[PDB]
Symmetry: C4
Subunit: 390 residues, 4 copies
């Protein structure tokens, strides 16, 4: 009878450092003998004794003969696979959990909960799996590509919270939050505040009663919608991040969005999932965010930190913490997760490093990990090492 | 000292949805580096903490050099292999349990029981394996290809029941039922009623005292012989399904078989294993059946449901529940199994999707899973995604 | 604190049947993607909860580029590998225990004991490994290729007994028996009686106090030296098998060796490891032996049984029990082992099926298993299914 | 709640013998189907119930297409991988622990501690990982390629000690020792005595209170700096080995370094990690050392023993114990580790056998193991068996 998991104080530290790189395609050469899966939207989720590396595979390998459509996101073949953190995700190594083109997963400290989203675009569906059993589902409410976090959900006392969203990519996409337990939705929280477009939320626990989410707005602003979920009263409001250090992509010069906090600025059509994680201290609270180096393209990734304050109203720029990836390497989706050590949690930030070589070749990604270890300053950057011509 | 397993109330729900697809041959391209096994007659069987994906391999892989005879069913090389549900069944991933060209497996909630059938056609033999030890056997009684369920058997309080059959494909094939425990046959139940031809029985627990089986009659009717096994008195009778929604293949227009329930109608030489599973409710009982879309060919697969009643005498047609596979994709053997969640059972229906490209190429199959999750209606269908030319 | 293992009453039965075939080279085609190891002298050994398939690999795979010398037996590369029974022994699947060109392994019911033999021909050495630690060794006493059983050893109350032998192939090879415990030799038993040549002993427990061994004499007779080890007084004597059903290879017409039991007959230079296992009944004792069909070549394998009596003085011929392999298939080393079920032991006989295609190609073997299941008569035979040209 | 580990009395014995060879590249032929990793600096570290084989992979396989730079030591792709001792370290078989081009690992008898070193040359960084969590770090103090042991660290009562060093290859490289516990540095020990250059220390427990290290001096002498760490007072001093049997490479004729113990002799620019391990007896203490056969090149490896005495002042030559590898085979890094058996420790010495074929081909290594088993004298040598042209 294990015990439910709760967020604890982070482990002693003051900087992030390169920890691990998973470059499956370093072994997919034509002259090689490996079958690394072609995937995208990878993230990490950790339980009390193990961390797992989830991803959305196109049910194809490299080398392989199904490179066509691997650039697309939604299709009937896509599946949510996963391997223990550290193993190369190969055909034989990974385990397929369910058909899905959008997903997330979390551990309530007793069992794994898998969330997948598939079905027709105008009527997609969320599927909750608790261990080996398919336990529940949620239907599309705005009837426009029901999608999910694309990163770990968050459990507490057996209660797991997950953002979902239905809505147009260029229009309105009011998100929701499902309170899950043992695999069955026990309540849906409808957020208030600026809710015209949230999605690909990167949620984490700021405290035992509050969950914050650095999310993505694809149509109205380069600013990041910020969710503050009160687990206590099970209510959630959203407001834009006030910092001049815009975390979306594309974005304009930092601080170039005149007006007050709520100001959307130019549309800057598009966005991207951003990494974000909490560092809980006895009396302080550090918020770590990721964001591509290029402000127009998904290249490079720099770390930013900001202790205490109110993301909703603080115009102050974030403190550049270092470069995790250079503008010469790809820097796509960024996510957050916390490794659980003896008596403290280790906040981490993973970076999807897509190997994009067009739409006439394979389309996959490597995963770079950076965690909070000791003091000093970020020392090294990460490269995939992959040549797409092999 | 684990506890014996018993069938419990299904989990809350009212519809089936695509859950998982296992397409091993998505990685068997000539330019790939995987060794997926060439198999057929796959099914699933779940224990208290894990589900396994069994199949009958021709002891060959793709790409490979032993594609000849993989279309045949019986030979001295065939073996009953199995992998945990979710893993791709490769040479290295699967485990060979015993030489067999016909089989089944169930978990008494304490240990796995494997059943295999091999030997000469006119004197085949059933082999029971309880874990690692070969525990017993049953001989051919009608001396004509002793065959078995081709899907999970069913245990209760340590008592596992399994249909077997000896008999001509075009003639009489009176089936039997073996009461097994700890691997040794403790009694054989001889069914009564219409018993001229039953086989490839798809059995499940309608209740703690009754096991029902939607079976196959290859020579006399497109209707499905229906077995009702009383675990209590250990007796079994068979009678045809009265519904106008004929579940075999080939079959004639629905409802075109005039006469009373027992009416065999035209022979319609041939048949196929059909999926069928129970959804036990406190006061209701839902019976789910599968059947190909085409009435003459093994293409497509639609779901049908019918709550309560007596399959033996209800002429009413089944309620179409949705399309699991389209007539453009292959739809062969269908089976039933129940995933065991915390306090309830999740009824599922798997579909064998054979990649038939003739008898001068490899002959294998993918497995599609659909389970009972939440309400609404079946949203998406399943495709193998496999190109046999690769 | 597990409990030491002891031999128990066999499980109910009266015949042997094909159980499992491990044909690793069914997946070693040039066009395949598997790396099955090239091995020889395979055997099986079972612990309370698992059976393992050991072999001596030439540290090479098929397809591979080190086929040269794989026909040879002794070299510095050879290793004792092993996989769980049922898995194909591939490069990635197996585990290398120690450098050895001769070996054996047994489970005292608490931990695995591995025995390997390597070193220079004129001064080989036996190495005992208890789990992960290298625990002891035994030196060559006759200074002529110290070799070992080539099959499972036998433990009882933590005491494991293993035959070893030093001596010329064409001359004298007086064998010995090491009493091992927790990996360290605690006594060496020197057999009496006809001891001019014993080797490749296939030992098993006839009872809780007696171990019998059907062994091999390569230079003096087609008859099989028979060892009777009294675990009680830790003494052992050897005498030839008196039956006219000569079990060695090559051999002359059955019963053609005139004279009394002890009569060696013609030399018939050569021999082979023979399968042999006990079936202990409350008041009866069945001895199962294997032997090639051809009396001059290692092709085919037939089963022979003989209940009660004294192998040392019974001239009566063995009762042919059936054909496990036909003269069209190779039939090399045969061994015995007992699977441990709930409360009884299942006697089995495995058959090495070497794929010999000369000395200018790869040289490996498949393993066929036949166990004691139910009554009736052996129904089917075993074929490797392997084409060496692929 | 496992118990902390402590060094115990070695197991009964008086000689070393070939135990195991791991030649991953025996399966990397162009015509093969395996993906063995390209690695270097391999070592072994054992916990109470398992031994693991660590190495530093260049994140590439053979056959593969990234052979360039595999000769180099430091780069952003390098990772500390590991597999259970006995398994071939393949892409799929191994587990990546962290990005690192220098490392070590030990088991406190409760959990694994991994140490990795990466970052910029002039500001490298040591990373401690305790299980799945990144727990701490140490910065470069001499700002010149912070490097580490390259072999197992040593725990006692939960306290793990590890040598690190910062400094020029041709100049000064004063080393340090980190006292770790549960993954966090709790104290740094600064050695005294001759400390102008120590590194690649091969440490082991001479007793429950003393740790000795046979290290490497790359610029001042062919003699081996010897560290004696008192776990009790947590202090460490270093002095050169006085024996005429110089263990470094290159070295001059044995005993050719005139003067007293402390005499450095000629520079003999360069060095190599040397194997060294303790054999603790109730009243005696055997020190085992390894060293290449050639005194100028890294070929061959012979074993040397010396019981009792003071390495710091004993001019007596070591007792040649045997040849583990011949001058025809490569003999690079040598390391020590102790397998833990029931109630005693088994001292072992592993040998890295690099397959160097230039800088225009792949650059990897095999691992040879030799342990203390029984009496007699080392009987056999070890060969890789690998042809680099395949
Ligand atoms: C452009 C598609 C749109 C969906 C409304 C969206 O913003 N979601 C979305 C975007 C990306 C990406 O920009 O890389 C990847 C996956 C997505 N997830 C899915 C489910 O497509
Ligand atoms: C046509 C063979 C006949 C056997 C009497 C039969 O109906 N059994 C049978 C049929 C199929 C199929 O129709 O696909 C597959 C396997 C079978 N199982 C076996 C054991 O062949
Ligand atoms: C012909 C070699 C001789 C050794 C004295 C022997 O009888 N042992 C021996 C024989 C065979 C075989 O006949 O197939 C295989 C392995 C053997 N084992 C070894 C260790 O070679
Ligand atoms: C020549 C490089 C120098 C580093 C100051 C050194 O002596 N370290 C060092 C040497 C070798 C070798 O000689 O084979 C291998 C790895 C090393 N480790 C690293 C970290 O390079
Ligand atoms: C940041 C924080 O307070 N985390 C808490 C921890 O202090 C407490 O031990 C546990 C109580 O449920 O929940 C978690
Ligand atoms: C459908 C049904 O009644 N299933 C039963 C369950 O109610 C009961 O807990 C158990 C008793 O043996 O057996 C199972
Ligand atoms: C054949 C035989 O007697 N086997 C015995 C078994 O009866 C007994 O339970 C046990 C006692 O040690 O040892 C074994
Ligand atoms: C060589 C030596 O003394 N090793 C000791 C062992 O004797 C003792 O049982 C234990 C006590 O902590 O620590 C270790
Ligand atoms: Ca594999
Ligand atoms: Ca945006
Ligand atoms: Ca494999
Ligand atoms: Ca029919
Ligand atoms: Ca593999
Ligand atoms: Ca003979
Ligand atoms: Ca693999
Ligand atoms: Ca030196």
């Amino acid at each position: 009878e294990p015990e439910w998991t709760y967020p604890r104080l982070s482990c002693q530290g003051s900087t992030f450092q390169k920890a691990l790189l998973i470059s499956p395609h370093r072994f997919g050469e034509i002259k090689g003998n490996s079958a690394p899966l072609i995937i995208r939207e990878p993230f990490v989720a950790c339980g009390p004794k193990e961390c797992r590396h989830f991803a959305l595979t196109h049910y194809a390998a490299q080398p392989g003969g199904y490179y066509n459509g691997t650039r697309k996101d939604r299709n009937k073949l896509r599946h949510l696979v996963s391997v223990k953190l550290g193993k190369i995700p190969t055909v034989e190594n990974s385990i397929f959990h369910m058909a899905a083109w959008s997903g997330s997963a979390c551990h309530d400290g007793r069992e794994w909960t898998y969330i997948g989203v598939d079905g027709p675009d105008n009527d997609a569906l969320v599927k909750i799996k608790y261990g080996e059993a398919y336990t529940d589902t949620y239907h599309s409410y705005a009837h426009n590509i029901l999608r999910t976090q694309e990163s770990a959900c968050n459990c507490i006392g057996g209660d797991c919270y997950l953002m979902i969203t239905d809505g147009s990519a260029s229009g309105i996409s009011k998100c929701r939050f499902l309170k899950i337990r043992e695999g069955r939705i026990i309540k849906e929280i409808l957020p208030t505040g600026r809710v015209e477009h949230t999605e690909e939320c990167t949620c984490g626990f700021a405290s035992n009663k509050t969950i914050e989410c650095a999310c993505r707005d694809n149509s109205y602003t380069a600013k990041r919608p910020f969710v503050k979920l009160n687990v206590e009263t099970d209510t959630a409001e959203i407001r834009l991040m006030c910092t001049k250090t815009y975390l979306d992509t594309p974005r304009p010069d930092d601080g170039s969005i005149a007006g007050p906090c709520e100001s959307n600025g130019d549309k800057w059509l598009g966005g991207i999932k951003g990494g974000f994680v909490h560092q809980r201290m006895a009396s302080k609270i550090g918020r770590w965010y990721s964001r591509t180096m290029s402000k127009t393209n998904r290249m490079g990734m720099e770390l930013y930190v900001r202790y205490d304050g109110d993301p909703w109203t603080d115009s102050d720029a974030l403190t550049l913490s270092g470069v995790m990836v250079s503008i010469e390497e790809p820097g796509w989706y960024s996510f957050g997760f916390e490794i659980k050590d003896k008596k403290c949690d280790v906040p981490c930030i993973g970076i999807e490093m897509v190997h994009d070589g067009g739409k006439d070749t394979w389309h996959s990604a490597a995963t770079a990990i950076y965690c909070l270890m000791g003091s000093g300053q970020l020392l090294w950057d990460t490269v995939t090492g992959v040549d797409m011509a092999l």
